[PDB]
Design a protein that fits this description.
rna binding protein; seven-stranded mixed beta sheet; 38% helix; 2 domains; two-stranded antiparallel ribbon; Helicase, Ruva Protein, domain 3; 11 helices
């Protein structure tokens, strides 16, 4: 993995974290411990989710003998699947291969944390903080922004890692929304996936897909059985989708232009007819 060598950058990440001396700090990807040792000087506890098991020997040996050692818990495993402890802030250097999943593991995690300071690849951070109509606005943008406040903090040159990556990196602060909106994020994501398949084409187009009609026909069958509704022998899911789309004015819009409130109105207009994306 790409270890962060630059003390200049590490020191800058740690102030952006703004550690209070009463905080549990989750560190994902402590590597050789370069940021771990500095975090331990300033935190009440440091929970380190090791990504490479081989590094764990020397990491514990590095802190061994200092008066901070009794604060370093180290969790060897698969961070995506492990249950996470209560932490107050999180700093983390993440590979792209787990970058999208980990962001939502953070945002769905309870109790809420205060903020996370995450190192990502360049383009990935720009998709997070991408506003509607931007070239890079995508499902990640609108999903992350529904649940969090995300801020692009600093660029980080690939010359600072050992061994260097091929792309520049960025540092990003993510503060969860607490309380989070009353949006059933399972359904929310289902709807947003369908409309971002082809984000420069219309929502009407987005629902003529067959995967879609299979998905919604399934869910609509459940609705009608739960509520003793009778599917008329001439019923068509596709026309129902198309009324809802027309009757909410969304039929000719494109997800590239759509902001969060727009999707809430879209979703409310589907759920109100018995259509769920589960």
């Amino acid at each position: 993995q790409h270890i962060l060598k630059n003390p200049l950058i590490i020191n800058s990440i740690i102030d952006k974290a703004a550690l209070r001396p009463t905080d549990v700090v989750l560190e994902v990807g402590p590597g050789t411990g370069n940021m771990t040792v500095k975090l331990l000087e300033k935190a009440k506890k440091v929970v380190a989710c090791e990504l490479d098991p081989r590094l764990v020997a020397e990491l514990h040996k590095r802190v061994q003998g200092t008066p901070v050692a009794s604060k370093l818990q180290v969790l060897v495993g698969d961070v995506l699947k492990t249950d996470l402890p209560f932490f107050d802030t999180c700093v983390a250097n993440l590979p792209y291969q787990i970058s999208s999943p980990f962001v939502f593991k953070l945002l769905l995690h309870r109790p809420f944390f205060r903020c996370a300071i995450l190192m990502f690849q360049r383009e990935f951070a720009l998709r997070l903080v991408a506003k509607p109509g931007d070239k890079l606005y995508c499902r990640l943008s609108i999903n992350t922004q529904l649940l969090a406040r995300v801020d692009h903090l600093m660029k980080v040159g690939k010359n600072n890692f050992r061994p260097p990556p091929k792309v520049e990196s960025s540092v990003v602060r993510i503060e969860p929304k607490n309380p989070p909106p009353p949006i059933n994020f399972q359904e929310w994501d289902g709807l947003v996936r369908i409309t971002f398949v082809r984000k420069n084409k219309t929502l009407s187009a987005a629902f003529k897909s067959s995967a879609v009609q299979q998905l919604l026909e399934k869910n609509y069958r459940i609705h009608c059985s739960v509520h003793n509704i009778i599917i008329p022998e001439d019923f068509s899911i596709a026309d129902k989708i198309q009324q809802i789309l027309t009757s909410t004015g969304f039929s000719d819009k494109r997800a590239r232009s759509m902001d969060i409130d727009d999707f809430i109105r879209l979703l409310h207009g589907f759920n109100a007819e018995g259509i769920h994306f589960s």
